Write an enzyme that holds these catalytic residues in place. Structure first.
Site, PDB file in Angstrom:
ATOM      1  N   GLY A   1       0.798  -1.206   0.000  1.00 21.31           N
ATOM      2  CA  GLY A   1       0.000   0.000   0.000  1.00 21.31           C
ATOM      3  C   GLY A   1       0.837   1.266   0.000  1.00 21.31           C
ATOM      4  N   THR A   2       0.172   2.379  -0.301  1.00 26.57           N
ATOM      5  CA  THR A   2       0.842   3.671  -0.320  1.00 26.57           C
ATOM      6  C   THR A   2       1.316   4.046   1.078  1.00 26.57           C
ATOM      7  OG1 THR A   2      -1.334   4.714  -0.133  1.00 26.57           O
ATOM      8  CG2 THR A   2      -0.366   4.538  -2.336  1.00 26.57           C
ATOM      9  N   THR A   3       2.513   4.622   1.149  1.00 23.44           N
ATOM     10  CA  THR A   3       3.093   4.983   2.432  1.00 23.44           C
ATOM     11  C   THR A   3       2.277   6.078   3.108  1.00 23.44           C
ATOM     12  OG1 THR A   3       5.160   5.581   3.540  1.00 23.44           O
ATOM     13  CG2 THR A   3       4.589   6.780   1.534  1.00 23.44           C
TER      14      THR A   3
END
Lengths: 245, 249, 235, 240, 234, 91, 253, 234, 245
Positions: free
Chosen positions: A33-35
């Site tokens: 997932g996106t940070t």
């Protein structure tokens, strides 16, 4: 072994080494997932997330990565989008129910405990899979700013600073260094800039792709304890500061 | 790289790679085993026929209804595992009679087709959020025929997949592939009902596994005055001898 | 694919129900023949050991009402319960409606019950194929229906089920002319006896016979030994 | 559902659900092998090329478009009794072999032996080979030839056409000039299914090799495909 | 094809029920004989030790109602619940119709019950088989036997359990229909003595019951069992 | 009007009491606790089929915390097994 | 010289282990020839190479396709290794495979011993082969010169036992006997070459990549075959990157 | 390979951290025909290509209206499409009656994504295999919410879903600066939308019988064009 | 040993008779690698469990395995914190329900019995996993005096005069046994809970073998009045007292 064949193809099964492997795989899913990062302030919390602008079509204003659970709780998740949105819906429902019951905003510890219970339940039985979303949420209430992180296993803790997603490694290291340098308790205005810097330093693992960062913060002194996004001059100042690399 | 046994073939709840849902697919495979059914629509009526598929001469060829009535102006023909079709026809008749009772008016064929496909949809969630009714989709496919003043004579094919199409001409069951190919070769908008029924007999002869006879093939027609009426054995024999008189030689 | 009821075989079959139907082949032979005005059902009773009590529970062919007869082959335990449910339905119909059950209606109900026990994987389908027969209330037309574990049912002029069924069915196919079915009861009984004799090598002690007649008349014979002899004389 | 059935392990996946050659699995002796009978009156030299294809792709040869005619049967037997046959079609200067591949009824040993017999029969006459088949382990339609492979390492071909390619690349009579085309498929052998875009691209391509006019060939092929062919199956009606 | 009881095998046979039929074959032999004037039940108890309280155990036979008795083979735990249900059903029939249950109707009910647990997937077949004995105006004395499959059959003399074939052969050789209870007892004791794996089949190994002559149902205590065993002179 | 006044309320006392208890728990402990408890109850009832013994499951008593209590509904507790199979499976 | 012959089995662990072995020693292994794939479900796939990008095992450029079953060779070790990519059509032909392919090959190259690899599913407790389940590996050996009497009697008489003790399984091995599984059929056929070795692994279905790694590590640890340790780095073939498809570039993370 | 060991059901994750069963559901959209939608400040337009089984059959309904202010197009599974469309219509009516208030586009989108997500958490139920474009206009302006069966919903100026949709998406990416400014001229906006879908075709041409267009705006209640009506837009 | 078959996933007996599932559930209790101590005083009970964070960013204020369950009952858990929190909330709900149902404050004995029985359901039901935690309930019973009860995922139920749990249980329990043996008494016999806490810290240090500061442990004390966890400053005071000694 990180796989443990045989005992992992069904939920709610203990491996010969104590692990329940489906939760381990759910943790693995959180990686892609996106940070996202959350920083604790002396009087608030600052959230930042690296939304990759996948294509030009997305309408910029209404496509938002940071979900608001309630007027006084911000939330950002990384991992499977459906599970994240469903968990956010459950959190919003819990906030609404608690407020309707006691007519006061839910203090963060009780809400975090309720969501941890909800997530932990799904790891218990055979017919349901663990939630594959690591979430950061926090806000300010009677007891001051709080910042929590809950995992697919349902475990959660209070955090002076949290990070998730693909860029978790460097972001976590930079956040450790920040908290080491400034144990006095950062102010929200300082924390915005620091979070922008850290999140850009996490972008070096995906340089080729364009990105935007949404910064939102809730602070006792700044916004009367209401969770409000950063828009306009302050966000651009954060851009300029972090652009120093 | 190694050849391994697949498992998406089993169960209706599993998607295959590229997102294909097989257990509905194999259900439509079971249709091909059923008796051939043919239907043709025209502005002056709609006709349809069926192979009786008498396994042995001892069976009563007069008491195996592959063609049935649902309402005065609305009937249908079916193929496949008749067990599920019995429930499907019963549901269709119940819906039609309930509609006529409640609204004191004839049931529109499209509404009936939608209601029937809704029952066929129940291997999963129903069209109105109803819980799943059965573990497998129907192994039955049928084509509805009827008349409505707002639609005229029309013919709907309905699959177990919960889908239905309006068809000028259609075929299902054994050898229905070549049957539909020949229908597409032959069909035209100007067909009269006499030509329609003779063409149905022709296609049945072309697809049928043995000699075409009045005791194994039967026809149905929908007409405004007649409504749903099944041709008797004498009528079908007349039509068959007319076939060998007109088309042959 | 054969592991469960809920999954089609790739070619369109449901192997579990087909296996159940094959299990129907395990039981003893049973046959029924429609005459012009009478219906005859014969059954191959398993060769009785001399220690069996002949005077009790001798008949597989059993009654469902004054005007309906049911016969079967396959798993006896399932058959008894299916018969019990059929009787319950027949009397429930007699209660809710003045007219008794039409034979077509009763066979439809039994087919529905068998089908319903196949709708879910939690229950084993009955390994039985009933041969419901009789005369419709106040109507002279003989009726004869066959049911299968899948719930498929069809009416027959003559039909066979159970062990060594193919030999009997082929014999009936050759010897039964729908243009002139056996009219008198004696001719139908002789045809039935001949049909079963092609399978039952044992004497008449194994062949039971039931004759059902219009106007709610049912009788079981104990004189077919004469019929067996006559066929022997014809042989 | 409140719980998955604990009894559903499920079964292991190293072994395939193929039919057994004989009921006596415990047999402890040399198991017999199928015999293959090939019609010797075919007179191969009269043909310039051959096409070998699985049954599920007959629709590419519409009789209304090319005068297909059956020359003779290839017959096989296996005493243990198993025995099957399929026709050799012919059109123009080309032979066409259709196998009727079906795992439920046919053990793949029959397919492999048939492929060996066919290729060893075509060896001496050196006809051009255009083997067209399907696979369920390929992401998109590929084209193949003995001197050029367009398969990524994880991708491969199975089933009867596997046997045909094997005999063409290795073993006796290897090294035969052939062109191959494999469209992506799903489901088990014989009952496979094909995507719409892939099928249309196959129609657009298969015509060029056979030399037929692309437009009229494509129209006939679509007519045969969408007219309730087993290859299309539920797709048209399952998907809007 | 045996993990599930709801699925037929390709040969059209149930492996789970056949295994249950195998199970009862391990249990101690139970034998029943019908005489012209009464019924006799005998049963060799598999479990045996010098410390077991023979004087009160009586777990091998059971009483369902006045003039109805059953011998059981297989699991005693499975036997107990069916016996209880049979007692409840018989007393309920008596309460409703105010007549004693005809034993056939009882056997029908219990056979249906045993079949039923072969039906639902979550229920395994009962690993027991019963010899029913009783009196009724319908047919007088009659012996019924029921297997885990849920079927039943009438008999004049039958054996159940271990070495059932040998006992059946002995009965088929020696039995007569005009026997009386006092001689059917000798026949049954002889059959058990020649079927047992024990050397002499002392009275401890044996449990016994009889119905004879309105009708007195008596289950013998070990003292009179020994007295009878010496009466027949085993 | 023809019924005894206490009949309507007492008939379903246990189930309405449990529903009220679950409502209170949801109010206090959030959605998770009622979900867990109801799923325990349903997974115990669903898996326990035994038509002969109407006595009821032991674990049902354990989970309701009435493993050491007695009620008049406990002291004083188409019926064929197959009817029970039909009813339970809803088949 | 020796031969190693993986057998299709639960998790395909022997095949994955042979992949690990071949790819982790590319500097040594080379392609030699394809065996007669008559009895296998036929296979055709492109060339394969170690993920390190080193020279492919198929040394000669003439090769453009990989057959269903081939024998790799190691000149330094004098070792042969079959890589079987598909199972046999049916167990009925398990006999013919050995009779007509393996033994002719062994006699062709004067192989001294055949080190067969196998995997056993925990569910297969039939005839109680599984013993000492705490262990997870098993090594068995057989020697013709020592067991000359055993083979002398075995080709004459049969005891019709559901289990057999021909193979001498070492201590602390999860089996002491073989009952009905694949080894019974072949072991008889190699008996009706100085020695035979049989390596077995208790296994379960799943991502058996690491399980196969550990199996290969254990096999090399045992002195079964004179091989240098590939422990320095195990290299997976490039083909495995496609084991889970090609990409997850879709908008649900 | 290993994927086959973990894609058997909606519950089990894979050691890579993926969930293949819902990935297949997402991939199922590729089988459906292309459907395109685009946004303008005053109007939002749908364009879809209908597929028919054979030349003998009628064309399918790719566009369904839910109210005079919104409707949707879809691709993928027919049964799931029917289920979701009917559920959304039911809930729109429920909102319009219970609250006397038109159901907001974003509200409907989230209300439907919540339903779509729940099926991915429980065993037995399968993820939906229908991707659909919800389009509507309300007090908050024109909207176009792309939907994916995995709960994901986002507001887009325009998009294409279904087979070979990426070409139309590329054209929309190349004309985003243009077609948005076409607000106030519905004919030109529909022409741009049609010119977008045209890039997705490889075999067939747009025709009055297969193409179908829907438009909605402040002055235009949700309307569906088909047949001869769409001739002027082709 | 590795599980054989269906027992690999669900709680059914194996050929050796043991329940592999429950035995694996035991091992999960060591997953978090914590270890705890419990000892009784004259009129109070004390529990000590390590609190190694260890991550720098994790907020120390909420790394707490000592859950307050009721006024007179406290508990400390071993194993993953999700299952620990689930069990603790079940205990709290059961305690409140008992207080309402029987009208008097819930004794520790009955509460631990209820938790053991609930664990017993999972120990024999097919479709539910045991919680995989080890709970130690501590209280000052109004009639039994100070008491300690321990429950384990197998559902056992044993009272202890002193207890140790976690990976290092052996050394700690042996040390406690030695102390009681040389003292010839079943309790520490100190008239103030401060002294009992100091003793517990001393014997913890003499077994774990490591001197540690206030950050590394959390102390819970149960008195006749109420149960309370000690704050950081109180732990610091106790450690200072130990150092002065």
């Amino acid at each position: 072994t990180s796989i443990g064949t045989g005992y992992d193809l069904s939920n709610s099964v203990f491996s010969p080494d104590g692990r329940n492997f489906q939760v381990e795989y759910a943790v693995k899913a959180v990686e892609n997932g996106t940070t996202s990062i959350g920083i604790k302030c002396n009087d608030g919390v600052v959230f930042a997330v690296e939304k990759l602008i996948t294509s030009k079509l997305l309408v910029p204003q209404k496509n938002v990565k940071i979900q608001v659970v309630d007027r006084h709780i911000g939330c950002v998740y990384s991992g499977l989008i459906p599970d994240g949105r469903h968990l956010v819906n459950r959190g919003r429902e819990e906030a609404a129910s608690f407020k309707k019951l006691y007519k006061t905003p839910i203090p963060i510890p009780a809400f975090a405990d309720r969501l941890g219970q909800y997530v932990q339940a799904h790891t218990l039985y055979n017919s349901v899979r663990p939630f594959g979303v690591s979430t950061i949420f926090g806000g300010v209430d009677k007891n001051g700013a709080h910042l929590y992180m809950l995992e697919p296993s349902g475990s959660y803790w209070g955090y002076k600073g949290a990070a998730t997603g693909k860029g978790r490694q460097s972001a976590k290291a930079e956040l450790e260094k920040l908290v080491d340098h400034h144990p006095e308790g950062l102010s929200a205005r300082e924390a915005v800039k620091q979070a922008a810097k850290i999140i850009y330093l996490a972008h070096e693992d995906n340089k080729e792709k364009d990105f935007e960062l949404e910064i939102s913060w809730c602070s006792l002194s700044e916004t009367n304890g209401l969770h409000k996004f950063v828009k306009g001059d302050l966000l651009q100042e954060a851009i300029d500061f972090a652009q120093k690399e | 790289m190694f050849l391994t046994r697949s498992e998406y073939d089993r169960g209706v709840s599993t998607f295959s790679p590229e997102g294909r849902l097989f257990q509905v697919e194999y259900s439509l495979e079971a249709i091909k085993l059923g008796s051939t059914a043919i239907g043709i629509a025209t502005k002056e009526g709609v006709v349809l026929g069926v192979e009786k598929r008498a396994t042995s001469p001892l069976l009563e060829s007069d008491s195996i209804e592959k063609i049935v009535e649902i309402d005065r102006h609305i009937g249908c023909a079916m193929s496949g595992l008749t067990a599920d079709a019995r429930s499907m026809i019963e549901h269709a008749r119940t819906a039609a009679v309930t509609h006529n009772l409640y609204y004191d008016e004839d049931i529109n064929v499209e509404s009936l087709t939608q209601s029937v496909c809704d029952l066929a949809l129940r291997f999963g969630e129903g069209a109105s959020g109803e819980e799943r009714l059965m573990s497998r989709p129907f192994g039955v496919a049928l084509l509805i025929a009827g008349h409505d003043a707002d639609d005229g004579y029309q013919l709907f094919h309905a699959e177990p997949s919960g889908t239905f199409y309006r068809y000028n001409a259609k075929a299902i069951g054994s050898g229905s592939e070549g049957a539909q190919a020949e229908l597409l070769n032959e069909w035209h908008s100007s067909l009269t009902l006499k030509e329609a029924e003779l063409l149905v007999l022709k296609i049945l002869k072309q697809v049928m596994e043995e000699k075409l006879d009045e005791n194994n093939a039967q026809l149905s027609c929908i007409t405004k005055q007649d409504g749903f009426k099944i041709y008797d054995n004498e009528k079908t024999a007349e039509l068959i001898k007319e076939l060998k008189e007109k088309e042959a030689a | 694919y054969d592991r469960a009821l809920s999954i089609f075989s790739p070619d369109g079959h449901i192997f579990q129900v087909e296996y159940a139907l094959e299990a129907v082949k395990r039981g003893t032979c049973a046959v029924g023949v429609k005459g012009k005005n009478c219906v005859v059902l014969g059954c191959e009773r398993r060769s009785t050991l001399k220690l069996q009590d002949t005077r009790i529970t001798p008949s597989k062919v059993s009654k469902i009402d004054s005007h309906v007869v049911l016969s079967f082959s396959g798993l006896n335990a399932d058959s008894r319960i299916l018969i019990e449910k059929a009787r319950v339905e027949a009397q429930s119909h007699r209660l809710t409606l003045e007219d008794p059950v039409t034979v077509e209606y009763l066979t439809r109900y039994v087919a529905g019950v068998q089908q319903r026990y196949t709708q879910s994987g939690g229950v084993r389908p009955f390994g039985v194929s009933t041969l419901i027969a009789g005369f419709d209330p106040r109507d002279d037309e003989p009726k004869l229906y066959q049911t299968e574990p899948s719930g498929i049912y069809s009416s027959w002029s003559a039909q066979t089920i159970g062990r060594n069924s193919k030999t009997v069915r082929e014999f009936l196919e050759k010897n039964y002319d729908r243009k002139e079915p056996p009219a008198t009861v004696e001719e139908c009984v002789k045809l039935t006896v001949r049909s079963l004799l092609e399978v039952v090598q044992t004497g008449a002690k194994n062949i039971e016979i039931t004759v059902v007649k219009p106007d709610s008349d049912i009788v079981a014979l104990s004189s077919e030994e004469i019929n067996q002899y006559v066929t022997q004389i014809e042989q | 559902m409140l719980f998955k059935q604990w009894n559903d392990l499920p079964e292991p996946k190293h072994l395939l659900d193929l039919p057994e050659i004989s009921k006596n699995l415990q047999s402890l002796e040399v198991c017999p092998v199928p015999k293959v009978e090939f019609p010797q009156d075919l007179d191969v030299p009269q043909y310039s090329t051959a096409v070998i294809t699985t049954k599920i792709m007959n629709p590419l040869f519409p009789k209304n478009l090319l005068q297909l005619t059956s020359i003779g049967e290839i017959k096989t037997t296996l005493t243990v009794v198993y025995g099957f046959s399929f026709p050799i079609y012919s059109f123009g200067k080309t032979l066409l072999f259709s196998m009727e591949e079906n795992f439920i009824s046919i053990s793949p040993i029959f397919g492999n032996m048939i492929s060996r017999s066919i290729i060893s029969q075509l060896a001496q006459f050196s006809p051009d080979i255009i083997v067209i088949g399907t696979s369920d382990k390929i992401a998109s339609m590929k084209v193949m030839t003995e001197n050029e492979c367009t398969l990524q390492p994880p991708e491969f071909i199975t089933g009867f056409i596997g046997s045909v390619l094997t005999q063409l690349i290795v073993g006796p009579s290897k090294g035969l000039k052939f062109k191959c085309l494999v469209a992506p498929s799903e489901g088990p052998n014989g009952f496979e299914k094909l995507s719409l875009s892939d099928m249309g691209s196959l129609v657009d391509l298969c015509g060029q090799w056979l030399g037929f006019e692309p437009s009229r060939y494509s129209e006939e092929c679509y007519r045969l495909w969408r007219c309730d062919s087993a290859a299309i199956g539920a797709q048209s009606g399952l998907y809007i | 094809y045996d993990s599930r009881t709801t699925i037929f095998s390709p040969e059209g046979r149930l492996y789970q029920v056949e295994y249950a039929l195998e199970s009862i074959s391990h249990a101690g032999t139970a034998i029943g004989i019908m005489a012209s004037d009464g019924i006799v039940l005998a049963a060799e108890r598999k479990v045996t030790s010098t410390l077991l309280e023979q004087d009160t155990s009586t777990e091998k036979l059971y009483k369902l109602n006045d003039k109805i008795a059953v011998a059981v083979a297989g699991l005693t735990a499975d036997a107990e619940i069916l016996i209880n249900t049979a007692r409840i059903h018989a007393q309920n029939y008596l309460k409703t119709y105010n007549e004693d249950i005809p034993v056939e109707i009882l056997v029908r009910r219990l056979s249906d019950i045993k079949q039923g647990y072969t039906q639902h997937g979550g229920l395994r077949p009962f690993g027991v088989s019963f010899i029913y004995a009783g009196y009724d105006d319908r047919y007088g004395y009659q012996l019924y036997t029921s297997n885990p499959s849920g079927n039943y059959t009438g008999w004049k003399a039958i054996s159940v359990g271990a070495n059932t074939s040998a006992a059946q052969t002995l009965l088929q050789m020696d039995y007569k229909d005009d026997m009386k209870v006092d001689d059917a007892i000798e026949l049954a004791l002889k059959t058990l003595s020649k079927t047992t794996d024990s050397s002499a089949l002392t009275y401890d190994r044996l449990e016994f019951a009889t119905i004879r002559k309105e009708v007195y149902q008596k289950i013998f205590k070990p003292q009179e069992i020994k007295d009878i065993l010496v009466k027949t002179g085993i | 009007n023809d019924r005894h006044p206490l009949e309507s309320t007492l008939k379903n006392w246990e189930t309405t009491q449990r529903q009220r208890q679950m409502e209170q728990y949801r109010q206090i402990f959030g959605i998770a606790e009622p979900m867990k408890r109801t799923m325990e109850m349903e997974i115990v009832n669903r898996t326990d089929f035994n038509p002969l013994s109407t006595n009821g499951s032991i674990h049902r008593d354990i989970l309701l915390n009435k493993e050491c209590s007695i009620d008049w509904e406990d002291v004083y507790p188409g019926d064929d097994v197959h009817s029970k199979i039909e009813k339970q499976l809803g088949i | 010289s020796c031969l190693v012959l993986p057998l299709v089995s639960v998790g395909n662990i022997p095949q994955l282990s042979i992949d690990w072995l071949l790819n982790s020693q590319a500097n040594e292994w080379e392609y030699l020839e394809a065996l007669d794939s008559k009895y296998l479900v036929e296979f055709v796939g492109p060339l394969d190479r170690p993920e390190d990008g080193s020279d492919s095992l198929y040394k000669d450029a003439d090769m453009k396709y990989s057959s269903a079953l081939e024998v790799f060779y190691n000149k330094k070790r004098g070792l042969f290794a079959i890589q079987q990519r598909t199972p046999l059509v049916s167990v009925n032909y398990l006999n013919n495979f050995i009779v007509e392919i393996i033994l002719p090959f062994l006699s062709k190259y004067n192989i001294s011993e055949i080190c067969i690899w196998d995997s056993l599913y925990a569910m297969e407790d039939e005839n109680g082969v599984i013993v000492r389940p705490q262990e997870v590996y098993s090594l068995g050996e057989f020697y013709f010169d020592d067991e000359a009497e055993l083979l002398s009697n075995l080709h004459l008489n049969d005891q019709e036992s559901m289990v057999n003790n021909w193979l001498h399984f070492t201590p602390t091995s999860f089996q002491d006997k073989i009952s009905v599984d694949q080894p019974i059929f072949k072991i008889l056929f190699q008996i009706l070459l100085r020695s035979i070795k049989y390596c077995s692994c208790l296994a379960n279905e799943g991502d058996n990549s690491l399980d196969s790694q550990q199996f290969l590590q254990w096999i090399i640890s045992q002195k079964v075959i004179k091989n240098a340790p590939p422990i320095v780095k195990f290299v997976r073939p490039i083909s495995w990157q496609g084991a889970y498809g090609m990409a997850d570039a879709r908008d649900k993370f | 390979m290993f994927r086959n060991n973990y894609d058997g059901d909606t519950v089990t994750f894979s050691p890579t951290g993926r969930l293949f069963q819902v990935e297949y559901a997402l991939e199922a959209i590729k089988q459906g025909s292309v459907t395109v939608g685009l946004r303008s400040n005053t109007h939002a337009v749908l364009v879809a290509l209908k597929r028919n089984a054979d030349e003998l059959s009628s064309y399918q309904k790719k566009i369904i209206k839910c109210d005079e202010h919104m409707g949707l197009s879809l691709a993928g599974l027919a049964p799931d499409a029917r289920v979701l469309s009917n559920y959304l219509r039911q809930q729109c009516n429920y909102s319009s009656l219970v609250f006397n208030r038109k159901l907001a586009v974003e509200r409907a989108g989230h209300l439907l994504c919540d339903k779509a997500q729940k099926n991915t958490q429980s065993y037995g139920g399968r993820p939906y295999g229908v991707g659909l474009l919800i389009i509507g206009y309300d007090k908050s302006g024109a909207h176009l919410l792309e939907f994916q069966p995995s709960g994901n919903v986002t507001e887009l100026y325009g998009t294409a879903i279904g087979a070979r949709s990426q070409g139309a998406k590329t054209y929309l990416e190349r004309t985003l600066d243009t077609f948005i400014k076409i607000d106030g001229n519905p004919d030109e906006l529909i022409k741009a939308g049609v010119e977008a879908i045209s890039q997705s075709l490889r075999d067939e041409s747009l025709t009055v019988d297969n193409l179908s267009i829907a438009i909605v705006g402040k002055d235009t209640p949700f309307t569906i064009y088909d047949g001869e009506a769409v001739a002027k837009y082709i | 040993a590795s599980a054989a078959g269906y027992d690999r996933h669900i709680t059914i007996f194996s050929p050796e008779g043991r329940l592999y599932q429950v035995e694996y559930a035991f091992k999960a209790t060591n997953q978090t690698n914590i270890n705890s101590l419990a000892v009784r005083g004259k009129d109070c009970t004390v529990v000590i469990s390590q609190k190694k964070v260890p991550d720098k960013l994790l907020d120390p204020t909420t790394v707490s395995y000592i859950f307050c369950i009721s006024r007179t009952i406290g508990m400390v858990v071993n194993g993953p914190i999700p299952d620990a929190r689930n069990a603790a909330l079940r205990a709290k709900a059961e305690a409140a329900e008992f207080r309402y149902k029987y009208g008097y404050d819930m004794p520790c004995d009955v509460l631990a019995k209820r938790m053991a029985n609930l664990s017993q359901i999972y120990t024999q039901r097919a479709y539910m996993r045991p919680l995989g935690v080890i709970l130690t309930f501590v209280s000052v019973d109004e009639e039994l005096g100070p008491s300690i009860y321990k429950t384990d995922p197998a559902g056992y139920y044993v009272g202890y005069k002193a207890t140790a749990t976690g990976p290092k249980q052996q050394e700690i329990t042996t040390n406690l046994e030695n102390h009681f043996k040389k003292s010839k008494i079943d309790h520490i016999n100190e008239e103030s809970w401060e002294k009992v806490v100091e003793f517990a810290i001393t014997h913890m240090i003499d077994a774990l073998g490591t001197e540690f500061s206030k950050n590394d442990l959390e102390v819970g004390v149960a008195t006749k009045d109420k149960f309370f966890t000690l704050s950081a400053e109180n732990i610091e005071e106790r450690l200072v007292a130990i150092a002065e000694q």
